[PDB]
Ligand binder design. Structure first.
Ligand SMILES: *Cc1c(COP(=O)(O)O)cnc(C)c1O
Ligand SMILES: *Cc1c(COP(=O)(O)O)cnc(C)c1O
Lengths: 280, 282
């Protein structure tokens, strides 16, 4: 395939990462994942807006404007002939002799982007998934979508080992988000989810789901709930660019309600489905 | 120069890092820094013991033994002809298609190691430095020396912008460590430092400085102290492989006592000196 390396689209084999790339020694960079449906990028502007905001938060100045960045992504999709799957892209502060503080503002940021054909998790959207509770030991700036992902890596593996699909994290019993998704709970036709502060990533899927709820007149309350309250919910699901709206029917051996996909989750899924590209 | 790449010492230009190296995508790896004095490696075994402990804490299996790793560093020092400086080395989980969970146990960890010529911090060791307090917002497993260093990066930059050498971190007003060092405080002839738990990295120089304290009969108490207590200390200093024992004489424009290096710091520095690699007559 072809990889985006800065502003060029090169063959995979051509890309070489420097051992002193700050993204390799300090996890000093930010990333995004954009889902593609039948050749079309879903909510691409929102993801690009978020990439730039993340970079701005740790003071990385991206050398291209948003219009150029958008253009490159389109070229990347086209050259690789991507139908349905996702684009992964990241930006690191640059290559410089190892030192914690920022380099001289002459160093250029390194941009890597590549695609992967990957089908929609249809089986999961229908049947639902298993999850587990993992304590959130991450840093206090979860709002930045950075490359420092060791906390999420350790959580995802704890779940993967128990045969669970996702690890729902919690700070002292208060549910925050999942290792790579946002968590939603429904009780009496009302949608609950942790507010978007420094404790969680302000997911783009999460915001699309909240817009879907507003469109079907379902009340939304951005209030955090405990692990205990979560098990008492009528319905529960996690959201992410790749997981879309995945129902969580069971957590740690305790079924959520009856262990079936609730009524409102289906309504959200149907509304969400009206937004994804489906050209002929 | 030459770079250690897995189990081989090769020329820099031959090293090729893959975009899906987990160290590049998730900061999934651990690291060590070893100081070299006039060709001799300082406390190398402790550092290697710590690299293996860190890797083990995140379930990475270093493919070869400690003796092989040591032999390799020695080679690396020899090939690069390093006099005084340090060896930086890191291990990541490996290259695998992007996914958060561990790959199959058939993926081999990536080992990268290289040297840098760097003199002892003479002026700092003698004159002392200024520091600044920064809120510790890092993750809760700071005992693991991993590649997730963005908090330390934002912290050191903050110190650097205010013209300071190091950022003294504090969690809930309690002093933990510096962005790349340990912090010690001296009061009425007693040595204080945060205990070695999940809140700080158990530094090698830290352990060496405590060993030095026992040797000069200086009492040591591993109890945490707050920002307020730190500013009322008689003496204060930071420790690290590259900083050794660097006196902190000021924090945010507040002199520690009178702004001069203290007697116990000086004594600790002299005792530390006897541990550094040196000949016998040269
Ligand atoms: C990526 C990610 C999400 C998912 O957000 P989307 O923007 O909807 O893909 C949620 N939480 C965390 C911690 C993430 O890293
Ligand atoms: C490396 C590191 C130290 C340094 O300890 P050494 O004495 O060099 O072993 C201290 N604190 C942090 C946060 C570090 O990452």
């Amino acid at each position: 395939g072809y990889t985006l390396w800065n502003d060029q689209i090169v063959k995979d084999e051509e890309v070489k990462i420097d051992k002193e790339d700050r993204g390799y020694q300090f996890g000093d960079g930010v990333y995004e994942v954009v889902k593609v449906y039948n050749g079309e990028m879903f909510t691409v502007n929102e993801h690009i807006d978020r990439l730039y905001a993340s970079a701005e938060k740790i003071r990385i100045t991206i050398p291209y404007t948003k219009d150029k960045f958008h253009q490159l992504l389109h070229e990347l999709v086209e050259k690789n002939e991507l139908n349905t799957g996702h684009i992964y892209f990241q930006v690191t502060r640059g290559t410089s002799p190892r030192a914690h503080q920022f380099p001289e503002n002459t160093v250029k940021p390194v941009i890597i982007g590549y695609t992967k054909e990957n089908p929609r998790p249809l089986e999961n959207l229908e049947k639902g998934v298993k999850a587990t509770f993992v304590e959130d030991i991450r840093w206090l700036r979860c709002d930045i979508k950075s490359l420092n992902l060791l906390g999420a890596v350790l959580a995802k593996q704890e779940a993967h080992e128990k045969g669970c699909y996702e690890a729902i994290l919690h700070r002292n019993n208060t549910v925050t988000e999942g290792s790579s998704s946002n968590v939603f709970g429904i009780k009496d036709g009302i949608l609950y989810t942790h507010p978007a502060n420094n404790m969680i990533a302000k997911g783009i899927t999460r915001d699309v789901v909240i817009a879907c709820a507003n469109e079907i007149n379902m009340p939304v309350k951005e209030i955090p709930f405990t692990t205990h309250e979560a098990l008492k919910m009528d319905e529960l699901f996690v959201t992410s660019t790749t997981s879309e709206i995945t129902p969580v029917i069971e957590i740690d051996g305790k079924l959520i309600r009856d262990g079936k996909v609730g009524e409102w989750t289906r309504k959200l899924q149907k509304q969400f489905e009206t937004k994804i590209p489906k050209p002929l």
